[PDB]
């Protein structure tokens, strides 16, 4: 957040979950980052740079996260036509 100078304030800028577009607080212990491993996709062997996600507790606790994690990987890979 900006000021007169454009100087940035706020002690931490919180992170905003992928499929809910809302922000998770300092205490919120049902919110998970989930690391998918990429592969080279020529031999199907692990190669470094991961795809990382974040999900909030609200969609987790109702049981909607399973669709969200699927759709996120469906707009990328690995998922073709499921």
């Amino acid at each position: 957040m900006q000021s007169n100078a454009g100087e940035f304030v706020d002690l931490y800028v919180p992170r905003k979950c992928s499929a809910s577009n809302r922000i998770i607080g300092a205490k919120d212990h049902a919110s998970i980052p989930m690391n998918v491993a990429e592969v080279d996709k020529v031999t199907g062997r692990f190669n470094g740079q991961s795809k990382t996600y974040a999900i909030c507790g609200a969609i987790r606790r109702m049981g909607e996260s399973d669709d969200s994690i699927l759709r996120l990987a469906k707009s990328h890979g690995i998922v073709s036509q499921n």
Partner: protein, 129 residues
Amino acid sequence: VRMNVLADALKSINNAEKRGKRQVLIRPCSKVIVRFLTVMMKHGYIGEFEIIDDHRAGKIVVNLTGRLNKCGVISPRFDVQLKDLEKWQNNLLPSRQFGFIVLTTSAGIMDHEEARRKHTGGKILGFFF
């Protein structure tokens, strides 16, 4: 019955956004709802929206994001005279800095920020933030 159409409309998109959705169905499609959502789209609280056509009155479908917190209606429709304005916007908005009271004037439907630059009072419809 369905005395006021716009008042029944906003509660759906309010309820839907809370649960976590991104497509809705709102009926029965008034022209008043269209120009409302046009202003609400420019600022960036909702995405592009598709008007289905029927002969009966139509149906509208919306694509939305979590940026919206709540859009409400204010009914019945009171007048504003550009000195009553400051009293309204204090009660109805979380902050001076952002939030947008909507209204209709003879210069068309618009936010309050625009009406002040045209020197037009008029009838208030709803709000959002």
